[PDB]
Coordinates of N, CA, C and O in Angstrom, one line a residue:
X1 N 0.9 -1.2 0.0 CA 0.0 0.0 0.0 C 0.9 1.3 0.0 O 1.8 1.4 0.8
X2 N 0.6 2.2 -0.9 CA 1.4 3.4 -0.9 C 0.5 4.7 -1.1 O -0.2 4.8 -2.1
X3 N 0.5 5.6 -0.2 CA -0.3 6.8 -0.4 C 0.5 8.0 -0.6 O 0.2 8.9 -1.4
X4 N 1.7 8.1 0.0 CA 2.6 9.3 -0.2 C 3.4 9.1 -1.5 O 3.6 10.0 -2.3
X5 N 3.7 7.9 -1.9 CA 4.5 7.6 -3.1 C 3.5 7.7 -4.3 O 3.9 8.0 -5.4
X6 N 2.2 7.5 -4.1 CA 1.3 7.6 -5.2 C 0.7 9.0 -5.3 O 0.3 9.4 -6.4
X7 N 0.7 9.7 -4.3 CA 0.2 11.1 -4.3 C 1.0 12.0 -5.2 O 0.6 13.0 -5.7
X8 N 2.3 11.6 -5.5 CA 3.1 12.4 -6.4 C 3.4 11.6 -7.7 O 3.6 12.2 -8.7
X9 N 3.5 10.3 -7.6 CA 3.7 9.5 -8.8 C 2.4 9.0 -9.4 O 2.2 9.2 -10.6
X10 N 1.5 8.6 -8.6 CA 0.2 8.1 -9.2 C -0.4 9.3 -10.1 O -1.1 9.0 -11.0
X11 N 0.0 10.5 -9.8 CA -0.5 11.6 -10.6 C 0.1 11.6 -12.0 O -0.4 12.2 -12.9
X12 N 1.3 11.0 -12.1 CA 2.0 11.0 -13.4 C 1.8 9.6 -14.0 O 1.8 9.5 -15.2
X13 N 1.7 8.6 -13.2 CA 1.5 7.2 -13.7 C 0.0 7.0 -14.1 O -0.8 7.6 -13.5

């Protein structure tokens, strides 16, 4: 589970 790594990457991925 990742919320901080996706809050910045999930926005580009």
